[PDB]
Amino acid sequence: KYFGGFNFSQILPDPSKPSKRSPIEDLLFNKVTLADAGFIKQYGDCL
């Protein structure tokens, strides 16, 4: 990961994260995930 002394850790994907993502990408995901499709096909929560 050495590139002429330039650090790319933030933008590069992180193997530690279960979904390989940038630490910056991890931040961006958390802020804007106000709503989702819900993925509730079971609908067991209703009734």
Next chain:
Amino acid sequence: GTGVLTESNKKFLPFQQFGRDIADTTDAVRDPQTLEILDITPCSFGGVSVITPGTNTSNQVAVLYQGVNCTEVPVAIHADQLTPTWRVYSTGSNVFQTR
């Protein structure tokens, strides 16, 4: 109305008889004979999409049930189901639960 009826866990005040959702449709009600709060939910629905290689290539089809859990999918109910004429075969054709 038409729907499936289960016992309603929502706490329901003595003067209260009807419950309404965000759309204000009646979702809970107390039985007349004995006051029993019962939640009303619509009977199972789901869009259906057909995947086909093309009539020129073949006649085999693949059916995707939009947004339905595979186990809750109704296949035995041929008589009471929209698009009833499809039995969509059965579990014998391998079924994959997709996202």
